[PDB]
Amino acid sequence: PHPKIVKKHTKKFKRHHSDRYHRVAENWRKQKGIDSVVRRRFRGNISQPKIGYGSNKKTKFLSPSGHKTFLVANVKDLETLTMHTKTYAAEIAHNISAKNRVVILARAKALGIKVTNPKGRLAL
Amino acid sequence: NSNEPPKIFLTTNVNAKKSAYEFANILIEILPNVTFVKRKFGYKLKEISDICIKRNFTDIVIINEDKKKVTGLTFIHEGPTFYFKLSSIPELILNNFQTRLGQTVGRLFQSILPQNPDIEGRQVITLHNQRDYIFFRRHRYVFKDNERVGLQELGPQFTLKLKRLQRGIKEETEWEHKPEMDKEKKKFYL
Amino acid sequence: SDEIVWQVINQSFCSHRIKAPNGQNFCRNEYNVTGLCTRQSCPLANSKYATVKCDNGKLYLYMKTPERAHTPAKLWERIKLSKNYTKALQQIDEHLLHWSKFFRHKCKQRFTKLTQVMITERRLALREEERHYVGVAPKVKRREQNRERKALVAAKIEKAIEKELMDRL
Amino acid sequence: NPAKSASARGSYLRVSFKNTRETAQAINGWELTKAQKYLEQVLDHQRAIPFRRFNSSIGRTAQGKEFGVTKARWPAKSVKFVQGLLQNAAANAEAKGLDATKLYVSHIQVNQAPKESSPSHIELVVTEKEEAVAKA
Amino acid sequence: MRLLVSCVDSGSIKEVLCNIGTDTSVQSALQPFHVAPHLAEGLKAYVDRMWVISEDEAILARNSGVVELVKISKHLKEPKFDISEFEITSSVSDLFDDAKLESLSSKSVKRTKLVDGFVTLCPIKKSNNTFVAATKSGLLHIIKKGEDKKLIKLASLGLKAPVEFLQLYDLEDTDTDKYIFAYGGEENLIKLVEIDSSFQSLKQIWEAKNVKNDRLDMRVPVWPMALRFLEPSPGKTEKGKLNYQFAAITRWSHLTKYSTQHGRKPFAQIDLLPNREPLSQMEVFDAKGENVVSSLGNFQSETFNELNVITTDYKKNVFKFDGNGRMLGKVGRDDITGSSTYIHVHDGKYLLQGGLDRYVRIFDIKTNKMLVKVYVGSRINFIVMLDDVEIE
RNA sequence: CGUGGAGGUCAGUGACGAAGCCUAGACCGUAAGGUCGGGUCGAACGGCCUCUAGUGCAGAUCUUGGUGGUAGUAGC
RNA sequence: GAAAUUGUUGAAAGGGAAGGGCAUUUGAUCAGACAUGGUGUUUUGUGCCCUCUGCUCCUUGUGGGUAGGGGACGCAU
């Protein structure tokens, strides 16, 4: 197995005053106003991003179920994962058709790789 | 047929999460002598067929689930097997089945639902056929003194659509619905 | 000489390399062990190398050396390998002799994995005849929904019921 | 339920959005012919039609005692158009074969149009209320 | 035309009468003259197979386990044409055994129980009254029709059961007297058996053995569906070995080309289709509508490359292949809606068709156009082309 | 990190649905951003290695367009 | 076919405010494996296993590829 996966901070950072205005969006950006409250970090305001939140190099990039993620298109591509079924799990880039997915599926169970997003575009 | 009561065997998908068991519990009303193993595990369908025949199961109903909504119903009677798929003792009605292919499914739902047909229905199960779509829902049957019979709609509700009809258990397909078969528009089958 | 061919492969690109979202970057070459193009697994800069690979038959150990380096059409030698996992492993660490530890350690593994793969694929060949996957094109959807809606709309569905009941009376 | 229902639509009317709005809202849920009765009674200066929204310059008036409001008005233009809508909705209804004794207005809507007037788009679906909706 | 078609619903035999170009799918096209049921004995007794040596004489194989015999004569109708009346002169009854089958119904993958029925009915020889009638269960009823006008049972013989298909090798001549059958079935390798006109003696002279294990080091299944002989192979005729050539279709879509002089393995086993598509029956046609075949169907020429075959699935499709397997193409692709039960090349220039769809169809080989389509309103398993007729 | 075009390369993906837009779905990044699941849609488009720019928005009594409150108001 | 902005239906709170931060609560709501084996032990067929008999290409080596007659290590049971 793996260590226990700890995010250190699980809440997406929002841009100051994002909600009070639409002409402002939700993608974090800095505050350069030297008067501003969010820049000088007054109590009770939003939390900047800062390096200390950087996660644990051991479990970094790990999806929760414990694997990592690797993004495949055709079967010839997932054959690179014959070795690592214990670390990487592979999922199927969105534009793949419903014709080839089912192929990546069957062959991806034979190899015994975990596909994070099966059930995409496939009924029974 | 009109000899022994239909003694049926309902089933489900392999894993078959909640919704399946739900709709199962909505089936138990419209049929009877209905049991179901409630758990199915890996076997080969030959086995299930045999063990059913020894137990005097005339016919088996297979529910199919997409883990979310029920999709498709296979009816297997030693004889033909139907694959429908669906989108949401009493009396019975059918409509607009007139055809060979139609009267096949007619013979189905006239065999299955009535439970060696019974009577006194103040609530009726209505199967109507519009183009390439079998529907049924269940009303309750109330005369209004002049002519027209008022009804309550007491549910449930959903349409079927026939897709497979094939001769043995699995044996050969005697009809299909292609994707293209509706390239042509006015056909209407049954 | 080889270290250069590496460094070229480590700055310019290989035709084949992947760069997964985390920092590490696969090597999709058909012939390599471990599938990560790094100094010691990238078959293009080694000049001495050995892997295991399925033919659709059993698992041929492919080997190369410096001497056929210039004669690619035939460079990889090839060996078959037994169906005795034990005897196999003995064949593998047999042919590899003073080939360094890397290739015995790893080649053995690739054998183990591909064997297991075979065994699985053999199981799955025998299973679940039922419920194949199927796709449904989008306009298939749209068509079905609408045509259904119109189907119901066309059937006023009580007029049938009542008229059938006046019938039964 | 569409199976038992009838739809009337209107569009590109030239009215006031606000007046048409309310005078649409007032009848939501009413039986058919009592509705026509209403619109009739309200076009002749009997029982005016309450405005819960736009209350500036609206004189206190007694008859609004039915609805909980002292404010109402006798708009001319609006109840004409919606009146007709109820007409043709009744036509669509009858040729459908529906039942005018069950028939009431299940849905009514108005919403703005291009442009400076304030034209409108109206939607109403009457339906025949059925006794005994659902078991279970 | 005048044709016969076995009606599975009532267990009868319809006769169909009409021109080239017929369709019932529309009021426009020209219409069938006549369709008739005859001698409808019930779902048990529906006709398993049918053979007509000469126009008046047609032998019934009847699923009740009963062989009958049919005298045919034309008479006035009710333009102008004639029809016939069909009444049974001779019979020999209860020729089956179910229970021996039923004991193996567990091993097969098929359905529930296994009915006994006739998997072959035909003449021997090509000038002879003899008939070799085969059962699922292995029982071989060999019955020559005595000149007494009556059918008489010559022998009942054993096979290694069940027996799916059986074939007589006539390509040599009528004379040499010592008859070769090849038969096969469930997990049952192809087997060459021989029989004398003493008709009590069958020795198994040859038996195939399966191809080597497949890609997965698993074992390819064994299910030969159908077999058609060729000439012996030219070249140096070799020590100890029968000289024959023949080719067989498996459920598993394997085309299998056997040459004894080579040995016991098939030298070519080639899957025609992706992933184990189940097939059925067979026909050997030729490109030009030509007649290349014996009267029981064995293709005549000594090289496979000159072979072309028609094979069906269990769903709709009907295919045309070469000796190599490269598909020539579908037939009735845009038409057939259902399992195509029966296909017989006729005169090399015609194609019989019929099945669960309930349209009897007739297609042309080289043009690949549907000539004739008739709605009998029944599942029909079998078709025979009677006299091609004028229309008055 | 992202945007527009270019030179390679994935024998990349794509009418079995590319882009795009919606999303009270999920995961990943500390963040810039990224990647998948549904939904609508119809024909092109993306990842790695490098080049080149008309390349990143909340503001400018900013420009152009669309909308509102003001209000069915003052009023005709 | 986006946003602003508006209508309808439903949710929810409100009577003196909305918005944000840390945390749970309650409601709704959604996701939640084609996991279904492994290690052996025995019975028994088949064949890439055994024993005969070949054939072939070349990097001629602790190599591939392939056929036929038979018999009892992988596979199935």
Q: Which residues pair with E92 in a beta bridge?
A: E67
Chain mean position to CA D45: 17
Optimal mutation site among B29, B88, B154, B159, interface D, most CBs of chain D within 10 A: B154
Neighbours of D5 (CB within 10 A): 17
Phi-psi region of D10 (alpha: psi -120 to 50; beta: other; left: phi over 0): beta
- What are the Cα distances from residue E355, in Å, to B8, E5, E383? 31, 10, 10
Phi, psi (5° rounding) for residue E200?
Answer: -110, -10
E284: nearest Cα among E343, E222, E333: E343
Tell me the domain boundaries of chain B: 1-183
Q: Which residue is nearest to nucleotide F9 (CA to C1')?
A: C15
Separation between the CA of A95 and the C1’ of F18 (whole angstroms) = 8
DSSP output for chain A: -------S--S----TTTTT-SSS-SS------TT-HHHHT-TTSPPPP-GGG---TTTTT--TTS-EEEEE-SHHHHGGGSS-SSSEEEEE-TT--HHHHHHHHHHHHHTT--BSSTTTT-B-
User: Mind telling me how many Å the CA of D58 is from chain B's nearest CA?
Assistant: 47
- The answer to whether the CB of E384 falls within 8 A of the CB of E362 is no
Q: Reduced to 3 states, what is the DSSP secondary structure of residue B39? A: coil
Smallest CA–CA distance from B181 into chain C, residue:
C140
Q: Does B183 touch chain C (CB under 8 A)?
A: no
Q: Are residues E199 and E142 in contact, defined by beta-carbon separation less than 8 angstroms? A: yes
Instruction: Give C137: exposed, middle or buried? Use CB within 10 Å, 0-12, 13-18, 19+.
Output: exposed
Separation in Å, CA B83 to CA B61, B175, B176: 10, 11, 10
Query: Rounded distance, CA E15 to CA E13, Å?
Result: 7
Q: Which two tokens stand for residue B95?
A: 């409509």
**Pairing outcome for strands D103-112 and D72-73:** unpaired
Residue A120, nucleotide of least CA–C1' distance:
F37
Cβ partners under 8 Å of residue C108, min gap 6: C89, C92, C93
Look up the CATH number of domain B1-183. 3.40.50.10480
Report how far residue E225's alpha carbon sits from residue E309's, in angstroms, rounded to the nearest whole number. 14
How distant is the alpha carbon of residue E129 from its chain centre? 20
Return the DSSP state at D127: E
Cis before E162? omega within 30: yes
Q: What angle do CA A79, C126, E216 make, to 5 degrees?
A: 55
Which uninterrupted H or E stretch holds E51?
A: strand E47-52
Residues of chain B found within 8 Å of residue C147, distances taken between Cβ atoms: 131-132, 182
For residues D122 and D20, give the distance between their C-alpha atoms in angstroms, rounded to a whole number. Answer: 9
Count of CB atoms situated within 10 Å of the CB of E130: 16
Q: Cα(E119)–Cα(B164) distance, rounded to whole angstroms?
A: 28
| Pair of tokens at residue B41 | 């595990």
- This structure's resolution (angstroms)? 3.7
* DSSP conformation letters of B53-104: HHTT--EEEEEEE-SSSEEEEEEE----EEEEEEE---EEEE-S--SHHHHH
- The residues, ordered by sequence, that sit 6+ positions from A94 with a Cβ below 8 Å of its Cβ are none
For residue B175, list chain E residues with Cβ-Cβ distance below 8 A: 337-338
- Of B88, B80, B111, nearest to B19 by C-alpha is B88
Distance CA D37, CA D45 (A): 13
Can you list the domains of chain C with their CATH numbers?
2-125 (3.30.390.110)
Which residue from B146, B132, B157 is spatially nearest to C162, judged by alpha carbons? B146
Tell me the domain boundaries of chain D. Answer: 1-136
In angstroms, rounded to a whole number, what is the distance separating the alpha carbons of residues E220 and E207?
A: 17
How many residues are present in chain B?
190
Task: Report residue A97 as tokens.
Answer: 């058709």
- Boundaries of every domain in chain E: 1-392
> How distant is the alpha carbon of residue C53 from its chain centre?
12
CB pairs under 8 A between C and E: 11
Q: Identify the experimental approach.
A: cryo-EM
Return the structure tokens found at B126: 């209505």
Q: How many CB atoms lie within 10 A of CB E392?
A: 8
Distance of alpha carbon D50 from the chain centroid: 13
- Give the nearest chain C residue to B91 (CA atoms): C165
d(CA E218, CA B65): 33
Q: Which residues of D33-65 are buried (b: 16+ CB within 10 A; e: fewer)?
A: eebbebbeebbeeeebbbbeeeeeeeeeeebbe
Place of tokens 């009021």: E27
Phi, psi values for residue B126, rounded to 5°: -105, 115
Neighbours of C83 (CB within 10 A): 11
Q: Angle formed by the axes of helices C101-125 and A98-110, to 10°? A: 110
The bridge status of strand E165-168 relative to strand E179-185 is antiparallel
Chain B residue with minimal CA distance to E113?
A: B78
In whole angstroms, give the CA distance from residue B17 to residue B65: 8
Q: Residue B64 is nearest to which of C131, C152, C154, comparing CB atoms?
A: C131
What distance in Å separates the CA atoms of residue E93 and residue E76, rounded to the nearest whole number? 33
Q: Do the beta carbons of residue D106 and residue D5 sit within 8 Å?
A: yes
Chain E, 185-224: which CBs lie within 7 Å of strand G? 209-210, 212-215, 217-219
Beta carbons of C28 and A111 less than 8 Å apart:
no
Contact present, E354 and E8 (Cβ < 8 Å): no
Sheet with E179-185, strands from edge to edge, namely E165-168, E179-185, E188-195, E202-207
* Among candidate residues E296, E328, E295, E294, the one with its CA nearest the CA of residue E311: E328
E355 token code pair: 């099945």
Are B140 and D131 in contact (CB < 8 Å)?
no
Q: Quick one: CA dihedral A65, A67, A72, A77, positive or negative?
A: negative
Q: What is the DSSP letter of E262?
A: G
SS3 label, residue B180: helix
Q: Cα separation of D37 and C145, whole Å?
A: 40
